[PDB]
Design a protein around this ligand. Structure first.
Ligand SMILES: Cc1ncc(COP(=O)(O)O)c(/C=N/[C@H](C(=O)O)[C@@H](O)C(C)C)c1O
Ligand SMILES: Cc1ncc(COP(=O)(O)O)c(/C=N/[C@H](C(=O)O)[C@@H](O)C(C)C)c1O
Ligand code: NA
Ligand code: NA
Lengths: 385, 385
């Protein structure tokens, strides 16, 4: 339910029953040998796991400090870690007797991921997306449609990722009998933050085995970008009890924390209740939710997962910010130095890892979670350059 | 050098030296321990090999005939099989003392793969691309630029892949002391058809191992699209001596064979000499090259590699055609039924496999080489609907 004080389940009474059925179903299937055999089979033959752990030799040399390794989630089918969670949840939903998946999306990768999983499993897919956001990203929208999903434009409120979630909740409240709400990050009411973290934990489990094989030791630091926080929790979680391993989450500093135009919920947000959870959210002078911004569409959500709020509070993980410009520089840097075009979200982690590596020893090890590939971001980087 | 009567080394005398040096270096490093360790290390950690062999269960049961397996080259770093060859040749060039790579490209995937390999290894990269091709695969043009490569639009002749190759050869003739011409298919003068096939053979060796795991037997049919023929040779080659395995190469039928707008070199072409090889080319009455067409840009090359000419001649492989319409239907069908968006090139193979599976028994097995992902073709598919 809770991670310290954070998380919980603060929802209308109509959602309590559906959320309890989800908890029970998850508890039933999470360690079920057949459910996991089937999931691992899809992850292997369909999604292409395991993804490699790549030693970025040129980048490491150029920075002259710590060894920089990249966990290559950019190679997962669909081009992002989102698939790990989509193909975890969709078969669970099907086993619960659901025939329909709904989901929120902003960067469109979770929409695509959900559309892919739904196509694969023969389930109807309706994707809620802000009416401003659908015009912002025509590529992923067309991908979703090609996959057989329906993209519902949201014309209410600020018409963005936050309001896509708002519409999805109303839909789910009416349709939960046959509809699974496939949430795309470690946010929302219990049990979603736990479920999504569990399905993303494969990243960390692979990375740990891979770094022990490659270097014979655990890393000194793990760096991952944090929007809602799923890719970060995915790679963090299996190292949480390894006291030696520093965990650093990188939020979108946007145009600078002083500008207001950013998405640094942990660094500059306030604790509060939204979308069924207690966590950090960006808030105005009055105390109401405030719009966020980032050059990276996937980091443009005003809140953050409760397990990160918890890790911040107990000082198990450190959270930092990287600006639009620094992410853009890192995007170009990785492309030119390693031949890997990263997602703009992932570029935030790379940007911070580059600063961090500089002040560390050559014997030390950083693993950066490369949460996705940058093919989706080409028009954005073109305009920005 | 020769595959029966096809192949050879038909170049100006000025290129005979560098080709002999390339053949010598390849001979030296081909079975060398360190070269192969590096290559396998790059293929694993950077490119993400092995790629999975996926059982398209829903597609299979929908057609109601033979089992359809997909070899998932769409998941290789870069989005296509081209990377296998780029990362094979680029380090060989470095070992030979070269500091610059040049390459041709039509669909842009080989250009991207060459730019990625060059970036990784810190080499300069110039890509020759036909002006027509620049305008219709512009996503890959920007990827190349972001990777630090220079894209040189080719305006000569019909402004297509054939013309790009013409300019590349002339460049290489002047710059061979420091430049390696990284050819992207099993075409060109010896030793390129052999080298590219060798670096793509990893596809078939993996597929062989994977189908024995999944089914306990070799497949009944292997199906692959054929432009120049590299992805086909890659998956074909390790099964050539397994007599029971049928090998089917699928060429672009375009708007129809009788319409004259296609790229079916093996099926409709005549014997000829171009780009340093004796093979089959689409040729008019007065010994000139007909302009090829396909909805799939990567199949838009008027010729075909000499090893395919040979395999057809000895009837070891069968070569068929699929129209634009049929490939497009397969693109949509795969996307909706399996949640995999294929390259339009690969959709030709899928299209033929679907027709073939219907005519075959449910106990029989078809492996289709899914040579690439379809993110590059989203605009082309929009127009062809
Ligand atoms: C490549 C990539 N990297 C990082 C993120 C940030 O999500 P987290 O991993 O959950 O912090 C994302 C998030 N993308 C979502 C989407 O595709 O809609 C995001 O916009 C929504 C969860 C709000 C991403 O696509
Ligand atoms: C995804 C994909 N699938 C199939 C092909 C056909 O090339 P082969 O494998 O050499 O027959 C291609 C060929 N692409 C080349 C390129 O990307 O430049 C082609 O346009 C040129 C080598 C002519 C491809 O990109
Ligand atoms: Na946030
Ligand atoms: Na051809």
């Amino acid at each position: 339910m809770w991670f310290g004080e954070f998380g919980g389940q603060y929802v209308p009474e109509t959602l309590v029953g559906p959320l309890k059925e989800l908890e029970k179903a998850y508890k039933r299937f999470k360690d079920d040998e057949e459910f996991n055999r089937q999931l691992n089979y899809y992850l292997k033959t369909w999604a292409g796991r395991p993804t490699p752990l790549y030693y970025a030799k040129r980048l490491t040399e150029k920075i002259g400090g710590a060894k920089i390794y990249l966990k290559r989630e950019d190679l997962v089918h669909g081009g992002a870690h989102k698939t790990n969670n989509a193909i975890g949840q969709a078969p669970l939903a099907k086993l619960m007797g659901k025939t329909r998946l709904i989901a929120e999306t902003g960067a469109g990768q979770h929409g695509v991921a959900t559309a892919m999983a739904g196509a694969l499993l023969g389930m109807k897919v309706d994707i809620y997306m802000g009416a401003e956001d659908v015009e912002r990203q025509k590529m992923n929208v067309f991908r979703m449609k090609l996959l057989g999903a329906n993209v519902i434009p949201v014309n209410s409120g600020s018409r963005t990722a936050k309001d896509a979630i708002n519409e999805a909740l109303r839909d789910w409240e009416a349709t939960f009998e046959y509809t699974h709400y496939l949430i795309g990050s470690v946010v929302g009411p219990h049990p979603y933050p736990t479920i999504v973290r569990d399905f993303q934990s494969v990243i960390g489990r692979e990375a740990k085995a891979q770094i022990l094989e490659a270097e014979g030791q655990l890393p000194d630091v793990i760096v991952a970008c944090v929007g809602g926080g799923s890719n970060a929790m995915g790679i963090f979680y299996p190292f949480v009890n390894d006291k030696k391993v520093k965990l650093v989450g990188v939020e979108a500093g946007g145009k600078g924390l002083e500008s207001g135009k950013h998405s640094a919920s942990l660094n500059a947000g306030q604790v509060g209740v939204l979308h069924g959870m207690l966590s950090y959210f960006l808030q105005d002078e009055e105390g109401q939710i405030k719009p966020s911004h980032s050059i990276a569409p996937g980091l443009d959500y005003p809140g953050v997962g409760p397990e990160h709020a918890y890790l911040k509070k107990i000082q198990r993980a450190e959270y930092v910010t990287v600006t639009d410009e620094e992410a853009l520089k890192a995007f170009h840097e990785l492309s030119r130095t390693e031949g890997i075009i990263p997602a703009l979200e992932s570029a935030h982690a790379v940007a911070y890892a580059m600063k961090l590596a500089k002040e560390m020893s050559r014997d030390e090890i950083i693993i950066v979670n490369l949460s996705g590939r940058g093919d989706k971001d080409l028009d954005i980087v073109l305009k920005a350059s």
